[PDB]
Symmetry: D2
């Protein structure tokens, strides 16, 4: 005889179970951007957030929940314990250790590895069938780490790899050609960051190859210096971090885009990081970005792009470096 | 023989005026939430951002540009100079000091009134015809301030006001009833702050008045203590602030909602702050929230909510404090 | 080797379980408006169509497919055999005779019950767990029929019922008020047809009772003749049929609206056809519209609207008319 | 006191300038498919419809209006009088005779020109600065006709052209490769009809040339027979017309795609009919489809595709046919 029972006659028993649920692990700037991007595209019927910093955590969930009136994601949960994560179709990992001067390289990744040693088994425990999307840097190596710890088949472990990189290149291409980024095509492949590969030959508007029309494209001997676009892609992140302290909006939109293909089983093609041992002369267990078909089973297929022998070596080189790092890691 | 000329044949050297342009002033946590919300709802063809911190400004502009590939707003610009703002349909003011843990919105007034005296005249010079949407706290007073300085008729100066408070209210109502906030209706009017008014008589689902079903609603002796919903609404800012340091996502979605009504001339009804002199008897030029019809000319109409004498006494009470602050003000 | 195989390396194979499949039975004018609306709101990952007219079926199927580039529904299938229907979460029934000019929906009952004998058993055989969304007229009776035939628990058999009449009501109220229909609240309940009942007491804007403000709302003496608004809702279908031969856009949009709450587990409240025995003096298995919570398990709850003795009498009358037809039925 | 006066306190009158108005001329199958797809993408703040058949026109308008609750387009009007179309940003012409089974679109010319002789002056009179989007067939000749009669600069006279043919092409391409159409690139250029030209050289996935992998692509030689994909494109309209009698959904989606780029000033690239005298060796005022940047001013730029030797001759032949027809046109 409460107000609720006087107002509502109940008919049904107890069968909840979110059908289309996503978890984001890490509520730093990247994680919440992914979160907001996912809420505003209606990708999920349940959103769960996890982090080890409890005050931050809860505060972010509340803020988001207070905007429910303007969303169509009817349940938003969070917490330090991975039970809130239960039965997620997709889990996005952004958590990472904060970097720091006064230490070199293996230190950084090993530290993140120590964190994934606790995060990963927790996620698989609660969502043994989910697809994993890794965003934490260095991304290609952490995707391998997530892949090894989890035990998942390679199709279900995906690193954001060069996805944003390629988005950046398309913005810059579009800005020069006075064309919208959707209509400028170009792929940034390989290792996310400094050693990424701009595949000039695939660069085009409307099917029209820019290399075929402008042979100097991507070389050092070109009056337009297109090579600069790619050097801008590599340096844009540092630039943004220098300017604002971190990047968030763009990687969030970027990750929402992947989530959409997967949640909705689109089979769109996106540059993401995948386990390519057995391709391009690559002989070790390493993750690099190639064009992958993304749907309800994660990466079900990838595109074999034809690469120049120079592009092959760049890839190979990255592979040897990631493997060198990886074989020194403590799991 | 440039690549661009070889690739693209130009028809129109010409270039039009900005048509569906929004400017956000202040790119802090609220400003950027508003920006991203706006961009994900396709509300504008041009987004302009202004701040006094240059590097932060450039950083946020670039991060947003980097996700252009996934958006549908082809022009994103920024600058310290208000020329980048010209011909904006809507200008959103999110700049100024924010609350520390426990601090009253009312303790921000002198320093935000200063800031406004420098911002507004610059906004007006470049967009004499825009609607002004004020978010900065204390929002009801700053809406009065924007109004006096700009010289705009009252229909074009809107305070985000109680649109957030009512959304929080519906969120909690919905959590109690197990119904989506879109289907739970209820209004919080007055000051966006401690002295806001829950109009118990309008709370309902499917048109059935909860007050009528349960006459103790909103009363001390209400065994269900619905009063507490209002008090959690009142307290929501502090709780979230003390948890993550500020609020942003909700006000972001809230602000996008108002923008949507304005840009698309929807004529929907929202609780926002407006000049209510000549209502509820109320005598002075005070701005506070009451439901308003919102559209291409801003606030074209006010809804006359029926209030009990207690409610009206609270509203007027709020009107009294607020005018006392404005009247003493600096400009 | 095949072009496909030189371009694409396959990791998995052809998995094929759709997670959010919708079926539309009947590709007439209503079926196809429901389809395109659903397609444009991204409610499904697979859409399947069926009809007995095979050439028409294929054409519609193909015309939607040719628009895939512009959609986010990656599989569209059709067939006269219900196997194309397998594993649907939501099956929408729009097949059957429709009203000629001036014709009562009730006059359609025997023809439509005759095709339901076949359609319902076939749909349940391939989607035993689906929710059933009935649209064919007379919609309340056919919801009862589908319920009796299928054996489904009543939470999973839903009539589109008065979502459309309420929407038309709010359109007309908004027109009189200069307010977007979204901010007008008004419920049309009971038979989707001539015996419908407008609930005067729940009509409001911003939570303010129009009836309390204007105590003659809904009455014969009312100078404003608001009762004319409901007459218009009652006549609306007839006027549209007389003008264009049938109706389709509004229903397509109403059905997509119900589908959305169901597929995204929103728990929004709509006026839909459901079993009302036990309420308002009704002692038989009558199906008509009452406000219900719609979510992933169909109707989970009913809002118990409070009615004036006049309002209730009218509703009980609508229930008698309906029962009077149901009882004679033989299927 | 009337309800409205009692409820709402008015601030001002004014009201006028529609901000983003679109008009559809012709409410047949095609026009309403355009109307609905535009309504569901929130591209306009006002939509006007016209037709010569008065009852049908009013009926469709009412049907759309009855769906207002589910839309964000606050005003829909219609009339046989073109004053209802005043100040449209975009006017879409779908009126006219359509193909019977097996009929060439070129056979409709004399019938549709006579219609355009009355229509174009009426549209331009009320909306002198609108962009005109032509859909009636034969769409390339009628775009030329609209251009001659209206006196508009060529940027503002656009034929929906091959946007649809290319969408068909990418749909079939994607079916063959197991990849979403969004991710399959390929262009169909020239006449929207039997003489269209598939540009094999620009066909690709992730920038990887299908023609380079598979040199016999598109010729009579290839065991894969890719040419049949283009034949299905040319034939698609007839097959569908035979099945269902006309086509409607894909064109409506195609047109809504174009409208989006025009209304939101996206500068995306589409194959649409435009004036190409001066290109590929063509010397008369022929309009046909090439990739064009579309934005707030219509077509601002064309993309110069590199066409193989065989492709240039086809286009020419295509231009010759059309011109031959044109030369004989009287107006
Ligand atoms: N792949 C790409 O293109 C991009 C990758 N990133 C990477 O994304 C990651 C996130 O960056 P930000 O959000 O700015 O960093 P952040 O430091 O603000 O976020 C990390 C969050 O994860 C939490 N965390 C740490 N260990 C955890 C664990 N044991 N379990 C759960 N939560 C844990 C932290 O408390 C923190 O809230 C960084 O590694 C960054 O390098 C950032 C931008 C782009
Ligand atoms: N109305 C409402 O419901 C709510 C209001 N707020 C208010 O929003 C305001 C900002 O909040 P946050 O964004 O978190 O603060 P913030 O510190 O993150 O950002 C404020 C921004 O304003 C900028 N700014 C200061 N003076 C300026 C001027 N002269 N011209 C241009 N930009 C200037 C600052 O540089 C800063 O980037 C505060 O007043 C806060 O109280 C916050 C939440 C809700
Ligand atoms: N509930 C509501 O608010 C509304 C309901 N309707 C009702 O929807 C129904 C359909 O209307 P329209 O689409 O305009 O009719 P329509 O005449 O345009 O199409 C009816 C379709 O049903 C198919 N059909 C007939 N028997 C079938 C069976 N055995 N199995 C599969 N398909 C079969 C026909 O082949 C045809 O394609 C009518 O009953 C009409 O009264 C119409 C508007 C609103
Ligand atoms: N370009 C493309 O990809 C496509 C073009 N079409 C063309 O679209 C056109 C429309 O076809 P439907 O909509 O299926 O035909 P429809 O027969 O369904 O409707 C044609 C409408 O135009 C109206 N109309 C006729 N004469 C008129 C005049 N003098 N002034 C104003 N309105 C007039 C009619 O009353 C009728 O309502 C046809 O020319 C068709 O070939 C159709 C599909 C695709």
């Amino acid at each position: 005889a409460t107000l609720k029972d006087q107002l509502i006659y109940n008919l049904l028993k107890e069968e909840q179970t979110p059908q289309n649920k996503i978890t984001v692990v890490g509520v730093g700037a990247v994680g919440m951007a992914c979160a907001i991007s996912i809420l505003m595209k209606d990708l999920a019927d349940e959103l769960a957030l996890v982090d080890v910093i409890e005050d931050k955590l809860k505060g972010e969930m509340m803020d988001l929940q207070h905007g429910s009136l303007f969303l169509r994601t009817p349940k938003i949960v969070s917490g330090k314990d991975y039970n809130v994560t239960a039965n997620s179709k997709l889990v996005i990992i952004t958590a990472g250790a904060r970097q720091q001067e006064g230490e070199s390289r293996l230190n950084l990744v090993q530290r993140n590895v120590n964190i994934f040693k606790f995060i990963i088994p927790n996620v698989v425990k609660y969502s043994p069938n989910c697809k994993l999307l890794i965003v934490s840097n260095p991304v290609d190596i952490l995707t391998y780490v997530a892949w090894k710890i989890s035990g998942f088949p390679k199709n279900r472990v995906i690193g954001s790899g060069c996805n944003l990189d390629s988005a950046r290149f398309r913005y810059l291409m579009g800005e020069r050609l006075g064309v919208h980024p959707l209509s400028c095509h170009g792929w940034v492949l390989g290792e996310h960051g400094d050693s990424s590969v701009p595949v000039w030959s695939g660069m085009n508007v409307a099917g029209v190859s820019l290399k075929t029309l402008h042979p100097d494209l991507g070389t050092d001997k070109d009056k337009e210096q297109w090579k600069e676009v790619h050097k801008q892609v590599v340096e844009s992140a540092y630039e943004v971090i220098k300017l604002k302290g971190y990047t968030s909006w763009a990687i969030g939109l970027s990750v929402a885009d992947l989530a959409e293909s997967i949640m909705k089983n689109l089979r769109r093609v996106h540059p993401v990081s995948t386990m390519i041992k057995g391709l391009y002369g690559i002989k070790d267990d390493v993750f690099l970005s190639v064009p992958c078909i993304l749907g309800q089973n994660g990466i079900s297929d990838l595109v074999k792009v034809t690469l120049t022998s120079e592009e092959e070596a760049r890839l190979k080189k990255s592979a040897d470096t990631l493997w060198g790092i990886q074989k020194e890691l403590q799991f």
